[PDB]
Structure formats: C-alpha cells, structure tokens
Write a protein that binds this ligand. Structure first.
Ligand SMILES: [Cl-]
Ligand SMILES: [Cl-]
Ligand SMILES: [Cl-]
Ligand SMILES: [Cl-]
Ligand SMILES: [Cl-]
Ligand SMILES: [Cl-]
Ligand SMILES: [Cl-]
Ligand code: NA
Ligand code: NA
Ligand code: NA
Ligand SMILES: [Zn+2]
Ligand SMILES: [Zn+2]
Length: 426
C-alpha cells in the first residue's frame, strides 16, 4: 500500500471536503502554503484566474508552472487516503467554485446533517436570500425563544462573507436594534471554508457567552458586566415578548417546525404560539400525572411507554386516543429498531424533543425511574395533537383569507371540532 494512517488519524468525511466548492476533494491540489483544494476548483479559481491561493492569497504562479509541466499538481498521499476511505463519494463526484453551486451544496448538507438547534433555507426561489431559525440555547437567558434571521449571500460567495442579521428583537450587547451582529466569523475571521452551519453555531455560542468588551450596545454591555442578574432578567423578558419565549416550558420551535410540515406557507403569531404552548404543557402535565398514578397504584417503580399508553386512553376522547396511541406506538417501534442518531428525536422520527421530555419526566418527580420508551411515546403524542390542532387552525386562517394563524383561528378550530373541544375546553 502506498501508505496508511493510524486509525485515530483517518480524516472524517467532513474533513475531506473542499473548502471552496464544499464537495469531497477529488485529485486534491495542495499548494506550497499547505492549503488544499480540489483540482476542478484549482483550475477554475487559481490556474485560470488569479494564480493565487484562494485561502491566503499567496502567489503560486511559479509553482503552478513547474508542476503543470510535470503533471505533479496532485497531493498523491492525500488523494490515496481519500479514495481508500470514501470511494463512493469520490465516484459520485470552470464549473467548480461557482457561488450558486456552493450555496446549493451547503443547503443539501444541511438537509443530510442539520446543525444542532438551528435551520436555514431560501425564502422564495432566490438561492442568495435565506431565512434562518435559531432557538435560544438552554445555557442562556434566551432559552425557549425562536429567533429568526436573514442571510444574504454575496455574488462572490464563498470568497466574501455572508450578511447575517437578526429579524427577531433580542437584548444582547453584540446585537443592535436593527439586528446587526458583531461577530468575528462574519468579518475579520471569515474564510471560504466556513459555512452557514458554522455561522449559526457561532451565533448560538455568542448568545450563550456574549463579548461585553466589543459591544454594539454599550448600555447592555455595562449591565452585563455590573448587574448580570438584571441582564439575564431583561434577556428573558425580551425572549418572552419577542422570541415566543414562555414563563413555563417552551415548545415554540417544535410547534413552528410542525406548522411548517402541515402548512408551510402559513405563519403563527406570538399570542397564538403562547396558546399552543399552554396546550402542550397541559397535555404533558395531565398525561405525566396520570402515568405517575398508574405506576404507583400498580406498585411499579418505573413509568414506561405502557403507562403512557394507558394514560392516553384514559385522558383523550376515542378517535383522538386511537390515533395518538397509533402514533406513539409507531414512534417507539421505529426508535427501538433504529440506530442511535444525532438526536433521540431523529432516531424516533419526531420533531418534538425526546431528550427534553425525558428530563422533564424525571425532574417532575413523577416516579423513581423513567424508561426510555415513555418520552418517545409522550413526545409523539404531543406532536400528533399539535399537528391536528394546527391543521385545523391553518384551514381556518385560509377560510378567513389570512396568511397567519391568530388566537381567533385556534379558538375557532377547537370549538368546531368536538373531540378537541372536549380535550382542550378548560
Ligand atoms: Cl489509512
Ligand atoms: Cl516551485
Ligand atoms: Cl464513501
Ligand atoms: Cl463501496
Ligand atoms: Cl437527544
Ligand atoms: Cl434516523
Ligand atoms: Cl419505556
Ligand atoms: Na448588518
Ligand atoms: Na378516553
Ligand atoms: Na434510548
Ligand atoms: Zn472544490
Ligand atoms: Zn494558501
């Protein structure tokens, strides 16, 4: 064999991607500065144009001349490693380097491996104009909020940075009232190899740990430095007011994702979202409480998916119970028959958070132990009920010639549906 690496040091697939086109490196060309790009990108952006490294701008015209003559451009050692360990991706692989193709590849990459607690895509058939959704991290006063952002890609992307700004009002020392963001990755530390995913992850990290010494809003930075408790309080209050936060547990991001499944071209107002959140918290409390009592009455230390199933039948009207039971069972069987995945929800095929529901079931002191199937089942039931409610309310907004769901549409859809009225009458 030409060579081999220690198992520890075999590069991942993502570490084998071309920093310019975001496709797997094929015939990787490593420049004398030790920056690498795939040969098609080398041809389109170096050999045919500037004769400079796209990453560090070092001139490589002499190097190119020498190695083009000898057909020694390719880093054969790297090339062998990549072919041996990712042969299928190599085989599937001035066209390269084009901005439109790079943005499309990043979009696909988001579909296959979406970033933790984020999401982004084109707003309306213009690939250079995206909307992004971030959820407030749990280690931050923004927990439970849904922050929307805009992303404008420049025509020379990825060589110039994307333009990213919050559309959702937020109380942050590095984010101003227009939504502009002071973050190194967007300007001083931008690199063609960086992606929208890494930017969204860098923003989430900024929400967790602001930088008060380089602020866009000096008053907020001063408060963060002097009265951190006041900063956290105002941050939380703004999250509730503008980012669909909640005094209780928040499900807003998951409600929104479900809404985009059943009615993609339909929105929801913060007040209607607050109602959805009350529903989910009520269904959770009722099911979890009944499941607590079922385990206790039957001298069982553990709440499993069986107590959740029985609680569902006791609490929901007939047709809703049967469908909820079917969805909860489908999720548990899919989960147990699937490999461990990035999120437990993804393993279960759900939008609602299985890991969070499990934590809540144990934090609520409902029982000594909580089996792994219970949160899968419960989360699927909350998702099913959310999906049925939103489908009706969306249908009602369409009949009222409205593009956004409001509390009136929610109240209409629940009063007109007999079983939902019984369940959520209050
Ligand atoms: Cl190897
Ligand atoms: Cl040379
Ligand atoms: Cl492969
Ligand atoms: Cl293969
Ligand atoms: Cl998880
Ligand atoms: Cl999966
Ligand atoms: Cl279980
Ligand atoms: Na801006
Ligand atoms: Na029932
Ligand atoms: Na598990
Ligand atoms: Zn490339
Ligand atoms: Zn370089």
């Amino acid at each position: 064999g030409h060579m081999a690496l220690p198992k520890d040091a075999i590069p991942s697939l993502s570490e084998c991607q071309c920093g310019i086109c975001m496709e797997i490196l094929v015939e990787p060309v490593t420049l004398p500065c030790n920056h690498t790009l795939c040969k098609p990108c080398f041809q389109s952006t170096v050999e045919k144009a500037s004769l400079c490294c796209p990453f560090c701008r070092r001139r490589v015209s002499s190097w190119t001349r020498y190695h083009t003559r000898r057909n020694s451009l390719v880093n054969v050692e790297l090339w062998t490693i990549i072919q041996k360990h990712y042969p299928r991706e190599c085989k599937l692989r001035s066209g390269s380097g084009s901005a439109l193709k790079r943005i499309n590849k990043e979009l696909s990459d988001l579909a296959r491996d979406p970033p933790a607690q984020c999401s982004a895509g084109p707003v309306g058939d213009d690939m250079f104009h995206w909307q992004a959704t971030i959820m407030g991290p749990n280690d931050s006063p923004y927990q439970g909020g849904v922050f929307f952002l805009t992303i404008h890609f420049p025509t020379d992307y990825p060589f110039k940075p994307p333009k990213v700004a919050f559309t959702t009002r937020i109380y942050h020392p590095n984010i101003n009232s227009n939504g502009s963001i002071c973050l190194d990755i967007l300007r001083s530390q931008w690199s063609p190899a960086l992606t929208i995913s890494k930017v969204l992850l860098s923003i989430c990290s900024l929400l967790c740990d602001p930088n008060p010494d380089d602020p866009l809003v000096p008053e907020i930075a001063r408060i963060y430095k002097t009265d951190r408790d006041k900063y956290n309080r105002i941050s939380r209050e703004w999250t509730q007011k503008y980012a669909m936060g909640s005094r209780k547990e928040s499900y807003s991001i998951y409600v929104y994702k479900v809404l985009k499944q059943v009615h993609p071209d339909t929105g929801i107002s913060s007040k209607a979202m607050g109602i959805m959140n009350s529903f989910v918290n009520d269904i959770f409390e009722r099911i979890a409480g009944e499941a607590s009592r079922l385990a206790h009455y039957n001298k069982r230390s553990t709440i499993t998916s069986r107590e959740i199933q029985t609680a569902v039948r006791l609490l929901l009207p007939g047709e809703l119970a049967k469908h909820a039971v079917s969805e909860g069972t489908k999720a548990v069987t899919k989960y147990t028959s699937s490999a461990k995945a990035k999120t437990r929800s993804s393993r279960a095929g759900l939008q609602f958070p299985v890991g969070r529901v499990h934590r809540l079931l144990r934090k609520g002191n409902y029982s000594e132990r909580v089996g792994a199937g219970a949160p899968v089942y419960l989360a699927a039931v909350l998702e099913y009920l959310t999906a049925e409610i939103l489908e009706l309310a969306g249908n009602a907004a369409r009949d009222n010639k409205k593009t956004r769901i409001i509390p009136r549409h929610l109240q209409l859809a629940i009063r007109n549906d007999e079983e939902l009225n019984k369940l959520l009458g209050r």
